Amino acid sequence: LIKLQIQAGQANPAPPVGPALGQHGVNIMEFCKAYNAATESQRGNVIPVEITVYEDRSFTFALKTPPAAKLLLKAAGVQKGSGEPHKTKVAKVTWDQVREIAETKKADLNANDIDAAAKIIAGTARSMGITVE
Amino acid sequence: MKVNPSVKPICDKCRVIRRHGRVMVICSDPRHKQRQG
Amino acid sequence: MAKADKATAVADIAEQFKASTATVVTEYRGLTVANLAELRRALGDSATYTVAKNTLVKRAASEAGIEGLDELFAGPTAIAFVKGEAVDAAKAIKKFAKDNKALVIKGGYMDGKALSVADVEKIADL
């Protein structure tokens, strides 16, 4: 069972993805074709996938949602987060933007309500030193 | 086997016991085995 | 959970019976936390599922007229309070219990009387 994050439609290159996918014997160029076809309209969003490998080299995969950490980074426009959070804060994010990111992650979070879901995303922004306003 | 005047539990699995008038440390890791002398 | 916390927890279980139409008692040993999320999401529209210390329930069970259900608080115990109707939650648990086989029902309490496992099964088919 392989869990890793791949760019939206740039799975073809091997060295980041190939060797990690080759340990279990899965042939690379077959996966990089199937994955790229499934995730093409979402260009610009890094998207992870759970890869399941069966005993006979045959594999199946299930897609996921782009990371909460990555969605906040582009919602503010900053390239990289702060190296010393709680001291130097790279950007600010309105509470409206937070509830949008919590909405697109709703299929992968614990919270039943949108109120508690937004708090989950707000805690992540505290990790990279992004103010929530 | 380490033979030093000071013996101590290097890891969290070592135990300090007392055999035949000696202080000893016994673990599952053979590097940590040591007696006092 | 010191003495003060035990007094707080025992108060919560006291009101659970009073505000609930009925209760169903089960055990959960072997259910992964992900497997529990299946049951609570299935029961979310109808009932609430909690667990509590076997002894600490009995002290809280003395504040409600449920004095006939002391024998069922042995071993691991998980109790479900049904707030809306009875069949809706019973069918969901009965379906869930058949598959996993690690969920076992010990009894129930409806119409102010203790109830057996074989009787709770028929409530789903009612």
Partner: protein, 387 residues
């Protein structure tokens, strides 16, 4: 009694080990003086081999029937069969396909048929297993038809002596099936044509050194592989140089002692006439004329070593340019993968098309190694001489 190699192939969990056990028991019961039974565990506990670095698990068992000594090879897993059939230190002359009647062929059986056609084992015959547990005649009929078509399509013996046997009951001690096991024995003795002897094949010698001594002249030396040589027998030097040379022997040295003929396996000392050291070098072959031809392109089926065994650590792509090692020397050669493939991970077996840069002798079934950086990174067989 001409000893002959065979082995079991077929999908895993079809009684290959069990059928070997039955054969051993029956041949020992018929000839307790001659054949000795092998225990089931020894069949199912294959000792590990690491020859040339390649890891294999094989079980070797031997027994003599009334006709000729037999050698029997059985391995636990499919990977062992692929590796052993490809690399092939000792190649079998005929194989038995243990297709159980419960479910007929599965892809593993198809690939065993494919590899058997590839490396060049000539003869194949079937032996349906678990005939006891299957009662319906229609099942065995359909399985027989399917296997017959599978064999015929792969250009094998369309009239293989198919036999129906229950291995488990026969091994247990049931006399109802010891007859079937011994009829396998007699079918194998009738079938599996006897191999041609090495001394019978035409002459062929790989050149190794060009020692030059006083009073005699250049002495091309190399262990004769196939055939026998005679003085005043015209021969051909064919190999890496562009042009073939035609010559004649003038004596055959062995151990400083002259002879008139040299048979296979003899560390001979051919002493040709009108030949100087500048005209022969290691890699060329001395052959009986016309028998063999040089080539620069071909197609083979190789098995690429893994990192653990000591091969590469990364795949290769088109125009991969390793050293190909035949006989006594290696020449570079560009590789082209088949269509529908553009990378070969280590530990995989695959067909490739090779284009060398210096002509060299070959024929279908020749064994060659792949060397890179000075170490072995693969092995295989030759399967088609394109040009």
């Amino acid at each position: 009694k001409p000893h002959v190699n065979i082995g079991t192939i077929g999908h895993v969990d079809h009684g290959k080990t069990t059928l070997t056990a039955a054969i051993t028991k029956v041949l020992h019961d018929k000839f307790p003086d001659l054949n000795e039974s092998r225990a089931f565990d020894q069949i199912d506990n294959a000792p590990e081999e690491r020859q040339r670095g390649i890891t294999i698990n094989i079980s070797h068992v031997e027994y003599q029937t009334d006709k000729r000594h037999y050698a029997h090879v059985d391995a636990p897993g499919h990977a062992d069969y692929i590796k052993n059939m490809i690399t092939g230190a000792a190649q079998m002359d005929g194989a038995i396909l243990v297709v159980a009647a419960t479910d007929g062929p599965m892809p593993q059986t198809r690939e065993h048929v494919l590899l058997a056609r590839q490396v060049g084992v000539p003869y194949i015959l079937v032996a349906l297993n678990k005939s006891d547990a299957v009662d319906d005649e229609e099942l065995i009929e359909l399985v027989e038809m399917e296997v017959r078509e599978l064999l015929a399509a792969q250009d094998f013996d369309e009239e293989a002596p198919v036999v129906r046997v229950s291995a488990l009951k026969a091994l247990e001690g049931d006399p109802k099936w010891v007859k079937s096991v011994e009829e396998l024995m007699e079918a194998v003795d009738a079938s599996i044509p006897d191999p041609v002897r090495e001394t019978d094949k035409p002459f062929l010698m790989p050149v190794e050194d060009v020692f030059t001594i006083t009073g005699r002249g250049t002495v091309v030396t190399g262990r004769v592989e196939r055939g026998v040589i005679n003085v005043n027998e015209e021969v051909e030097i064919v190999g890496i140089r562009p042009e073939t040379t035609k010559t004649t022997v003038t004596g055959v040295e062995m151990f400083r002692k002259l002879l008139d003929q040299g048979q296979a396996g003899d560390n001979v000392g051919l002493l040709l006439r009108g030949i100087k050291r500048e005209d022969v070098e290691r890699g060329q072959v001395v052959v009986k004329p016309g028998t063999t031809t040089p080539h620069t392109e071909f197609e083979g089926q190789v098995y690429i070593l893994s990192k653990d065994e000591g091969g590469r650590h990364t795949p290769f792509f088109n125009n991969y340019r390793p050293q190909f090692y035949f006989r006594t020397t290696d020449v570079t050669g560009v590789v082209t993968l088949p269509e529908g493939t553009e990378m070969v991970m280590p530990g995989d077996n695959t067909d490739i098309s090779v284009k060398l840069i210096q002509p060299v002798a070959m024929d279908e079934g020749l064994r060659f190694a792949i060397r890179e950086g000075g170490r072995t990174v693969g092995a295989g067989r030759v399967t088609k001489i394109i040009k």
